[PDB]
Amino acid sequence: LLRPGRIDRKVEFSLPDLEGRANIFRIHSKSMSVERGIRWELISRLCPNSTG
Amino acid sequence: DRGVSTFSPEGRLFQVEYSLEAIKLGSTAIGIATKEGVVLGVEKRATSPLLESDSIEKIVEIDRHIGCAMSGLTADARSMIEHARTAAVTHNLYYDEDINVESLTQSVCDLALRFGEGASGEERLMSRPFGVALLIAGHDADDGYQLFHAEPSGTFYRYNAKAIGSGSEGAQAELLNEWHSSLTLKEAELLVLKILKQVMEEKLDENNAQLSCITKQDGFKIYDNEKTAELIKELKEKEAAE
Amino acid sequence: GYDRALSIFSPDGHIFQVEYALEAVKRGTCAVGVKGKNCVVLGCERRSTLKLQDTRITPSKVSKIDSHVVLSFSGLNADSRILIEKARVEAQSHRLTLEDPVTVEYLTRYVAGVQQRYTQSGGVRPFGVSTLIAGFDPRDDEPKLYQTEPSGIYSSWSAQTIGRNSKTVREFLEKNYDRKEPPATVEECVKLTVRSLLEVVQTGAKNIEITVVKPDSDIVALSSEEINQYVTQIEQEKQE
Amino acid sequence: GSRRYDSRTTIFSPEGRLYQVEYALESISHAGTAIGIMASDGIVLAAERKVTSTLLEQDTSTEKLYKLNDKIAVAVAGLTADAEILINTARIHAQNYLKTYNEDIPVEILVRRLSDIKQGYTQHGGLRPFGVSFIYAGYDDRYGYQLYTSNPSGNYTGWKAISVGANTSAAQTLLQMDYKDDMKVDDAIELALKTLSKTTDSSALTYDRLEFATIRKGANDGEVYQKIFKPQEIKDILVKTGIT
Amino acid sequence: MTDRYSFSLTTFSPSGKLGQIDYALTAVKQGVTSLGIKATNGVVIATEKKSSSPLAMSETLSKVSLLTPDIGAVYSGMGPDYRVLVDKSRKVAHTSYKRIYGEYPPTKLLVSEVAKIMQEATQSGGVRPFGVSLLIAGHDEFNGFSLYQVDPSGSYFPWKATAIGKGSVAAKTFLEKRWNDELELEDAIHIALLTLKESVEGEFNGDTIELAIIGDENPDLLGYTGIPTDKGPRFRKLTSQEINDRLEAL
Amino acid sequence: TGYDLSNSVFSPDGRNFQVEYAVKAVENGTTSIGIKCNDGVVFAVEKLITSKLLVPQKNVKIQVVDRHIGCVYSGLIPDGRHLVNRGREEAASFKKLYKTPIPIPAFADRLGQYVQAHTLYNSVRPFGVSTIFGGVDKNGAHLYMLEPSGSYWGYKGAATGKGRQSAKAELEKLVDHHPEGLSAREAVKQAAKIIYLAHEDNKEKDFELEISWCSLSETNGLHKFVKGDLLQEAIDFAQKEIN
Amino acid sequence: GYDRHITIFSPEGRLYQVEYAFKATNQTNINSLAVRGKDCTVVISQKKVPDKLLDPTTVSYIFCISRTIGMVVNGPIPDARNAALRAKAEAAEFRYKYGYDMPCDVLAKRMANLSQIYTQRAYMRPLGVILTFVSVDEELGPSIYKTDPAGYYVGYKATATGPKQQEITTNLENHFKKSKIDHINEESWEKVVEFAITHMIDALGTEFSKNDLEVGVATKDKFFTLSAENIEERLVAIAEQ
Amino acid sequence: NKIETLDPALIRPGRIDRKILFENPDLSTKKKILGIHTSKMNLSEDVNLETLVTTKDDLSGADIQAMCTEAGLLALRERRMQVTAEDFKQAKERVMKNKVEENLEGLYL
Amino acid sequence: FRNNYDGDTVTFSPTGRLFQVEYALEAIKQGSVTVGLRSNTHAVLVALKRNADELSSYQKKIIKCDEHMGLSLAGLAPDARVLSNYLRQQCNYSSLVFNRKLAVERAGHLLCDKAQKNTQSYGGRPYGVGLLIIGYDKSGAHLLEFQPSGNVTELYGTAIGARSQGAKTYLERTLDTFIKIDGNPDELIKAGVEAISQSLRDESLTVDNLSIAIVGKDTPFTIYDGEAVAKYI
């Protein structure tokens, strides 16, 4: 299957940088009521690289 | 073993790649330099009310007109600071002259560089370049006020504004816009504290922030408690309009 | 002899050795310091359980480094012996060259520089040893209580716990001492140190040493009858 | 060739307990038993030989109890080769201190320095550490009799009774029940020989598999006298106690 | 240019007891047979010394070597290790010995010096242990005749009788019975040759069998009889004829 | 398996396998020839012109030792330069002691010890180069080759590099046809021929011919490069021969 | 595993480096024969047929150690040069200190000590050559000593080295035991040469020519090779006979 | 015991949400657990609840189960007709002794 | 990849390659691009100064050894600092004793010996840096290319760093043009401006980033930047 023809693109998805993981945290957090003024980037900073 | 000798596939030194992560854990330090004064403001780490916050230091005098901030492995950075102190005194003897911040920056990188592998032109007694980065600031006529950021790489860059430690990435993003040529000492001071609360996990206090400056008038001078408090108090009044 | 690299940084930006060193400290049996504004009070557990061990000639953890500088530890018992000798020579080297006994502040940096040299050299493993350093600065009566890490970092602390089960002991010091005003007298302060140690020791009066060091090189040791006196008070609190 | 290969014994262990030192205690317990019993008026010191071969002239050759000087005798358990180097080092150290200060070295000082050498080996020596425990039976006027033992770790601990070598627990347990604080040297002689026989698998522990020494201040005109007891003198006191 | 080793290759086995000490010992056992009987008026040391190739000179091959004119020694194990260890032992004894005493070393003393050197080989990184066992047979005033056995472990003990090499087990037992408290010099040699025949049978020419005694004193051998109160060489290396003679009186 | 890896440990056949690895570089390197002639020795080396960025006559591998020994080498280029330095060190030291030029036999003997020394070290790698060296001295013309493994012999003719196969097959027939040898002058033309047969092998890039010589009669037992009219005729005439 | 690979004592106690070294000699395929004359020591050896690249007259096996000692080396060609240094250098050493050159027995003792040392360090390995020192000592008269990579050594009445040493031994065994002579009792050294060549041709089965030869004769206070003219003159007598 | 005994695969993390790490009983915990056990042993009421806690070495509630069993085991050997204050106290020493014996002395250096 | 041999410097693969050198060639391409060209009477270096970010100031890449000699760094930056201090001392010594300036050929040769030495034995990294050494001496203008391996080679133009092929394309066409230009600084510099625009793809010059230096017959070592380089553009 790996041989060419069959598979024309191969792409590695990896755990993103701090700015993207701020964005993934951002979407979920918005949906919930929170005390506003929240620094999304603060919460992501502490977390090492991590899954969605 | 993975020595200093043996490189990564790209060709980088191992220790240079690892040291980036070491610094990241370190204490956040924020430097904005202007031609009206270098302002160094740092986060003091605290784990207890029982820790005594007077004793600890993260801004360290290296010379009469030289201030420094340290991040990385602290215990390795304590030696680094002792030798830097030696270098400065030794120059002062030879030329009867206050070392340029820039030369001092180079003299320190030459001393981190020296391993343990076993050379044939050099003295070995370490194992690696230190995996600590330092912000070396100071004043001299030629360049005016300066702020340097030394890497474990054996590379020095001069900066207008540089943030290292935990908050490296988010502080830098603001510092590009907000830093200007127009800024003076009172301007600079307020800005540093503002960035510092966003990247500080807990609240901002005058008892977990330590400010200093290098001015040419005073040399290296650590601000008392009272000034620090007052600039915090002044920043509050503006935040409550919102 | 050995000189090959062991200061090889992890890819998680740490010396491996330094991690292992931290692990070791814990195991050493607890030592506690709480300074008053008129004393430093030192408590520690010693081995004395074993019938047919003569305590007079079994070495005591608490160590004279100078008449007014004392040192206690948690960690490798082998490596401490080396440590204590190093401090003793330095202490005397100050009186020889700069004159006057070590300032406490100066001995704290000396002790720290030994650990640091072990991390600069790849050859030499850091000691797995933390120490409590306490004393009176020259010409002065101010109590200093210092703390070390085996990694080569030092700091001053109002109260401290190192060694076995720091958790229970830490939680007690956060409620029983407050930083705004230190214990007023020697007697009030001895009682708190005693109360804290018995938490993880469980009773005894024979096994535990309490050593009070007061200004002007006064080191005096509490009799077992005096230790129990404090226990007798505390039994009444626990009952009510 | 030499770069590739490693036999580093100078790794800081992750358990806080260096693995090489662990194995040297195993090796100690293969070697015969040596017992230090401290009494107010002396140290009664006795160690069984571990050879038992008949062709071998055990009689002549002391191999465990070595007299360093007048007040200090050492019993060996562990590796006999490693041990020889430390005997010469311990002998020269007591002489040098005696020369400088004109006082027999306090016991404390001597034991500490020797322990610190063992320590040094794993500190950054690169050396495998000596796999020997020594009971240093010592006297000095100030502190009375003093009894200390060493470890391959380079740690010493004082005691009023100690055992090393084989049957550490079996010997220690008997001494705890039978020895009382106040028993004198006189009792301890009788006590030592009998507990050893009972630990060992031998039906009677012969005089020729024994080494016996005492350090006592009950030698007249305020003096200190040691005597490594000769194999036949061990035999008479062996008969009294009924082992034979 | 020194090997980049900086540490002891020798490690404790995880069950105790050095790997390398065990490794060195096997060689002594594998190597050819030697026996010795300590006696009251001498010491007999005996070894097999088979032709390497008939064309090879079988006279220049030696396994007896001198340490002092009074003390001789024989080994089993690695041949090249022995030669060097002897040379070191001449210096360790003689010079240093003369400076602190100015005599020939007594046997007890000489044997102890050798023990430390074996230990230092092993301990030292980059240098693997000497795997040879030597029997040092000698005379001193204060202990009469003495026989010590020196193990490659750096340990020594004196023995009434001992054997090392392949045939050691058989030999020791044979001897054990024959050994007496009072022994004739003549009988010690008869008994020695009798056992040696059983180690490997045939080749009993006194050429291929190397025999020495630490016999009685000679101002004759000394080469000055002008004062004959001086001790002569105690050590004597026997001729082939002498051995031939012993076979008839056995 | 493991004996191979460990530098300076007997392979189970015999002799460290790294010494064999080093030989392989020398084959991959450029042609170098050394010809013993009546008068003296004639060296030629193939200098590839990869590009015209390269400076004509100026990427010489020809390095004088003392003043009467040419040295030229094939294989790993840095390794040569270290062994080249070593020859220099050795020549001077002889003149300290004995106040006169080193003989060529003595040079061949003393250079060879240096290779062996590093290859009974595990810590210091093999040399990756065969060196052709020689000159004319008081004791006459002499030609030696130091193999990568360290062996010195007299040679009528010597060759190393990729095109030694071509070089060898000619030199055997040239000696068969001329057992009385040939003058160094004629051999300037004949060196040029030999190199042309070897550039069949190294046909990928163009080349530049460089001869040097040390001759008894004509360079007066000093070593100097061949250039101008001597070199030109050698090019011109050889060309015709090989067509 | 590991123990075996590098120098250190294997579990068995075997030194694998040494075993391999003995194979190494045979790989050069050189064969030697040495006999004892009455007053000379004749050693003769093969040399592989010359290349047109090489010079056929060059030799590199023979090395004049001192006036007394000549040496012929069988084994690795590169290591033979290495070994040749140490023999001459220690030969000269003895002249300064003790005032004269080493005997044959005494030079062997010294090389053997050196060999042993080379084996213990990792970095150092035993010289893979087998060395054949020839001499006429005064005290021992005609002498041959064979010194091994191990550091092992012993004198010989007559010796052989190489893959086909097996054939030579059997010939010399026949030669010297039946007669019952420890060495050749023929006085003229020329007839010892005549005769050692004769035994070589017989034993390996292949005739020798000037080019394979190479004749070493050591005498009292001299080591010499025979001139090429003389090599050819011995051939005329050998064929008639 | 752990999720590392299983091949890990527990799907949807937030679908298994919070995970609970059991610490072992501490000093205060084992008072209460003790109180149940001592009510079964006849006449052990005499020995104050608190002082029972103090005199023993810090141990888990499981080891109280071992100790309570030890009291009855000793009462059976003695043919102690009714469980006493003396049994409960004796019980502490033998139970603590078992646990130390079972441990292997590897020597803290 | 790791594999092969590179923790061990001595040991090589069957082919004979040492992996350490391969990595060191890659290292060049990661860092600064610099181009050189020379006429018979002048020697030119054109270096693109670079930084980490905007607030960072730009940082020299030509480090002046002497009034008569220079070098430019492109692979490892700590390595270059070492060699330059070293080379400063060697020019002093040679000028002091022999009264003769350290000529560019020897200087590359002394330098090879130092790098080679660290790679010969255990201990010591290969110097990964590629240096382009210019110098003006009695025998006119030289440009040498210091390989990480320890090989020097005389060239007339060369380009180093990633995508160096573009620059070389230009220089070979105008090889003849460039050499026959002599006595002209302006002319030379103008060509070298164009050489480096071939290399750069999806990347911008800036005049302050562009740093150009000459050394020649009438000119000592001089560095020109800003308004100065605006002239040659």
Count CB atoms within 10 A of the CB of residue I213: 21
Q: How far is H108 from chain D (nearest CA, A)?
A: 7
Distance CA H71, CA H91 (A): 5
Residues 6+ apart with CB under 8 A from I142: I38, I43, I104, I105, I133, I134, I135, I136, I154
Choose the mutation target among C202, C203, C236, C239 for the interface with H, i.e. most H CBs under 10 Å: C202
Max Cα separation, chain D?
A: 67
Question: Given CB atoms, is H108 within the 8 Å cutoff of chain C?
Answer: yes
Bridge partner list, I223: I213
**What is the total count of domains within chain B?**
1
The answer to whether H54 contacts C203, with C-beta atoms less than 8 Å apart, is: yes
Distance CA I154, CA F50 (A): 12
Max Cα separation, chain G?
A: 61
CA C95 and chain centroid, separation: 24
Taking one residue from F and the other from I, the number of pairs with CB-CB distance under 8 angstroms is: 76
DSSP SS3 for D109:
helix
The answer to whether E158 contacts D57, with C-beta atoms less than 8 Å apart, is: yes
Q: Which residue has the tokens 């190494």?
A: G24
Chain C contact set for H109 (CB, 8 A): 76-78
- Cβ-in-10-Å burial (0-12, 13-18, 19+) of G184 comes to buried
Q: CB–CB of C85/B41 below 8 Å?
A: no
Q: Which two tokens stand for residue E222?
A: 């000394």
Q: Which residue has the tokens 């060193």?
A: C21
**Which CATH number does the domain housing residue G77 bear?**
3.60.20.10
Q: CB–CB of C132/C72 below 8 Å?
A: yes
For residue E250, give the DSSP letter.
-
Identify the domain containing residue D151 by its residue range: 1-244
Distance CA E44, CA E192 (A): 7
Q: CB–CB of G122/E126 below 8 Å?
A: yes
Distance CA F69, CA F91 (A): 10
Q: How far is B76 from chain C (nearest CA, A)?
A: 6
CATH class of this structure's domain C1-240: alpha beta
Q: How far is F223 from chain G (nearest CA, A)?
A: 23
Element (H, E) at F160: strand F157-160
Q: CB–CB of I38/I143 below 8 Å?
A: yes
Distance CA B169, CA B223 (A): 27
CA angle D30, D35, D41 (to 5 degrees): 165
Chain I contact set for D3 (CB, 8 A): 7-8, 122
Distance CA G78, CA G95 (A): 28
Q: Which residue has the tokens 């200007």?
A: B180
Question: Given CB atoms, is F56 within the 8 Å cutoff of chain I?
Answer: no
Residue of chain H whose alpha carbon sits nearest to that of D119? H109
Distance CA E115, CA G156 (A): 35
Distance CA F243, CA G9 (A): 65
**CA-based Rg of chain E, rounded to a whole angstrom?**
19
The answer to whether C78 contacts H109, with C-beta atoms less than 8 Å apart, is: yes
Backbone angles phi, psi at C69, to 5 degrees: -135, 120
The DSSP-derived string for E141-170 is GGGSEEEEEEETTTEEEEBSEEEESTTHHH
Q: Which of E48, E80, E87 is nearest to E65 (CA)?
A: E87
CA B226 and chain centroid, separation: 23
The answer to whether B169 contacts A18, with C-beta atoms less than 8 Å apart, is: yes
Edge-first strand order for the sheet with F32-36 is F157-160, F32-36, F40-48, F207-215, F223-225
**Long-range residue pairs from G82-87, CB within 8 A, at least 24 positions apart, any chain:** G82/F113, G82/F116, G82/F120, G82/G127, G82/G129, G83/G127, G83/G129, G83/G131, G85/F113, G86/G111, G86/G114, G87/G63, G87/G111, G87/G131, G87/G133
Interface of G with E (CB under 8 A): 3, 7-13, 105, 109, 112-113, 115-117, 119-123, 145, 150-152, 154-159, 169, 172-173, 176-177
For residue F35, give the DSSP letter.
E
The answer to whether I7 contacts D4, with C-beta atoms less than 8 Å apart, is: yes
3-state secondary structure chain C: CCCCCCCCECCCCCEHHHHHHHHHHHHCCCEEEEECCCCEEEEEECCCCCCCCCCCCCCCCCEEEECCEEEEEEECHHHHHHHHHHHHHHHHHHHHHCCCCCCHHHHHHHHHHHHHHHHHCCCCCCCCEEEEEEEECCCCCCEEEEEECCCCCEEEECEEEECCCHHHHHHHHHHHCCCCCCCCCHHHHHHHHHHHHHHHHCCCCCCEEEEEEECCCEEEECCHHHHHHHHHHHHHHHHC
Chain E contact set for G113 (CB, 8 A): 83-84, 87
Q: CB–CB of G73/G147 below 8 Å?
A: no
Per residue in I88-98, is it b (16+ CB within 10 Å) or e — as a string? eebbeebeeee
Q: Is the dihedral of CA G168, G169, G170, G173 positive or negative?
A: positive
Backbone angles phi, psi at F182, to 5 degrees: -150, 145
**Which CATH number does the domain housing residue B47 bear?**
3.60.20.10
Q: CB–CB of E36/E137 below 8 Å?
A: yes
Backbone angles phi, psi at G178, to 5 degrees: -70, -45
Amino acid at G195: F
**Which CATH number does the domain housing residue D234 bear?**
3.60.20.10
Q: Which residue has the tokens 């038993």?
A: D33
Residue of chain H whose alpha carbon sits nearest to that of D23? H106
Q: CB–CB of F158/F194 below 8 Å?
A: no
Q: CB–CB of F214/F136 below 8 Å?
A: yes
- HSE-CB at H50 with a 13 A cutoff on CA atoms is 7
The answer to whether D1 contacts G6, with C-beta atoms less than 8 Å apart, is: yes
Q: How far is I37 from chain B (nearest CA, A)?
A: 27
Bridge partner list, D216: D42, D225
Helical spans, DSSP H, in chain D? 19-30, 80-101, 107-120, 168-178, 185-199, 231-240
The Cα-based distances of H90 to C18, H30, H87 in angstroms read: 45, 19, 5
Backbone angles phi, psi at D130, to 5 degrees: -75, 140
Backbone angles phi, psi at E158, to 5 degrees: -95, 145
Identify the domain containing residue B217 by its residue range: 1-242
Look at phi and psi of residue G234 and say left if phi exceeds 0, alpha if psi is from -120 to 50, else beta: alpha
**What is the total count of domains within chain E?**
1
Active centre residues of F (catalytic): 30
Q: Do chains B and A touch (3 or more CB pairs under 8 A)?
A: yes
Distance CA I142, CA I136 (A): 7
DSSP SS3 for D138:
strand
Distance CA E208, CA E53 (A): 12
Distance CA D131, CA D25 (A): 7
Distance CA D38, CA D184 (A): 9
Backbone angles phi, psi at F234, to 5 degrees: -65, -45
Q: Which residue has the tokens 């194992």?
A: B127
Per residue in E52-66, is it b (16+ CB within 10 Å) or e — as a string? ebebbbbeebebbbe
Breaks in chain D, named by the residue before each, with C–N above 2.5 Å? none
Q: How far is D2 from chain F (nearest CA, A)?
A: 8
Bridge partner list, D16: none
Q: Which of F174, B62, E236, E129 is nearest to G15 (CA)?
A: E129
Roughly what angle, to the nearest 10 degrees, separates helices H85-102 and H61-78?
Answer: 120
Backbone angles phi, psi at C186, to 5 degrees: -65, -40
Amino acid at I80: A
The Cα-based distances of E174 to B198, E23, E210 in angstroms read: 93, 29, 20
The answer to whether D2 contacts F123, with C-beta atoms less than 8 Å apart, is: yes
Q: Which residue has the tokens 């004892």?
A: G36
Distance CA G39, CA G55 (A): 33
Q: How far is I11 from chain D (nearest CA, A)?
A: 10
The answer to whether B22 contacts C13, with C-beta atoms less than 8 Å apart, is: yes
The answer to whether C125 contacts D179, with C-beta atoms less than 8 Å apart, is: no
Distance CA I96, CA E215 (A): 77
Question: Given CB atoms, is B150 within the 8 Å cutoff of chain I?
Answer: no
Q: Do chains I and G touch (3 or more CB pairs under 8 A)?
A: no
3-state secondary structure chain B: CCCCCCECCCCCEHHHHHHHHHHHHCCCEEEEEECCEEEEEEECCCCCCCECCCCCCCEEEEECCEEEEEEECHHHHHHHHHHHHHHHHHHHHHHCCCCCHHHHHHHHHHHHCCCCCCCCCCCCCCCCCCCEEEEEEEEECCCEEEEEEECCCCCEEECCEEEECCCHHHHHHHHHHHCCCCCCHHHHHHHHHHHHHHHCCCCCCCCCEEEEEEECCCEEEECCHHHHHHHHHHHHHHHCCC
Backbone angles phi, psi at D161, to 5 degrees: -150, 145
Q: CB–CB of E74/E135 below 8 Å?
A: yes
Q: Which residue has the tokens 């803290």?
A: H108
Count CB atoms within 10 A of the CB of residue C26: 17
DSSP SS3 for F203:
coil
Choose the mutation target among A21, A45, A46 for the interface with B, i.e. most B CBs under 10 Å: A45
Q: CB–CB of G5/F2 below 8 Å?
A: yes
The Cα-based distances of F228 to E45, F71, F139, F233, I206 in angstroms read: 84, 21, 30, 9, 49
Q: Which residue has the tokens 């030495």?
A: I117
Count CB atoms within 10 A of the CB of residue C11: 11
The answer to whether I123 contacts B161, with C-beta atoms less than 8 Å apart, is: no
Q: Which two tokens stand for residue H67?
A: 């100790």
* Torsion angle, alpha carbons of H85, H89, H95, H97, to 10: -150
Subunit partners of chain G (3 or more CB pairs within 8 A): D, E, F
Q: Which two tokens stand for residue E237?
A: 């290396």
DSSP SS3 for D78:
strand
Residues 88-117 of I with CB under 8 A from F: 109, 112-113, 115-117
Distance CA D112, CA D97 (A): 14
CA E137 and chain centroid, separation: 6
The Cα-based distances of I61 to B155, F122, I57, I168 in angstroms read: 12, 39, 13, 20
**What is the total count of domains within chain G?**
1
Distance CA D18, CA D9 (A): 9
Distance CA B105, CA B107 (A): 6
Per residue in D111-124, is it b (16+ CB within 10 Å) or e — as a string? bbbbbbbbbebbbb
**Which CATH number does the domain housing residue E81 bear?**
3.60.20.10
DSSP SS3 for F162:
coil
Q: Which of G127, G119, G38 is nearest to G85 (CA)?
A: G127
Count CB atoms within 10 A of the CB of residue A3: 6
DSSP SS3 for I140:
strand
Question: Given CB atoms, is D169 within the 8 Å cutoff of chain H?
Answer: no
Identify the domain containing residue G73 by its residue range: 1-241
The answer to whether B10 contacts I7, with C-beta atoms less than 8 Å apart, is: no
Distance CA C121, CA C11 (A): 19
Q: Which two tokens stand for residue F82?
A: 């270290």
Identify the domain containing residue F87 by its residue range: 1-243
**Which CATH number does the domain housing residue F32 bear?**
3.60.20.10
Q: Which two tokens stand for residue A12?
A: 């590695």
User: Taking the domain I3-233, which CATH number applies?
Assistant: 3.60.20.10
Per residue in E178-197, is it b (16+ CB within 10 Å) or e — as a string? bbeeebeeebbbbbbbebbe
Bridge partner list, G160: G33
Q: Do chains A and E touch (3 or more CB pairs under 8 A)?
A: no
Element (H, E) at E35: strand E34-38
Q: CB–CB of C76/C131 below 8 Å?
A: no
Max Cα separation, chain C?
A: 63
Identify the domain containing residue E6 by its residue range: 1-249
Residues 105-144 of G with CB under 8 A from D: 122-123
Judging by DSSP bridges, how do beta strands D210-219 and D42-48 pair with one another? Answer: antiparallel
Distance CA F189, CA F198 (A): 15
Q: Which of F74, F42, F47 is nearest to F157 (CA)?
A: F42
Q: Which two tokens stand for residue A26?
A: 């951002």
Distance CA F164, CA F161 (A): 6
How far the first Cα of chain D sits from its last, in Å, is 60
Distance CA E178, CA E188 (A): 9
Distance CA B211, CA B225 (A): 9
Subunit partners of chain E (3 or more CB pairs within 8 A): C, D, F, G
Q: Reported resolution in A?
A: 7.8
**What is the total count of domains within chain D?**
1
Distance CA B114, CA B122 (A): 7
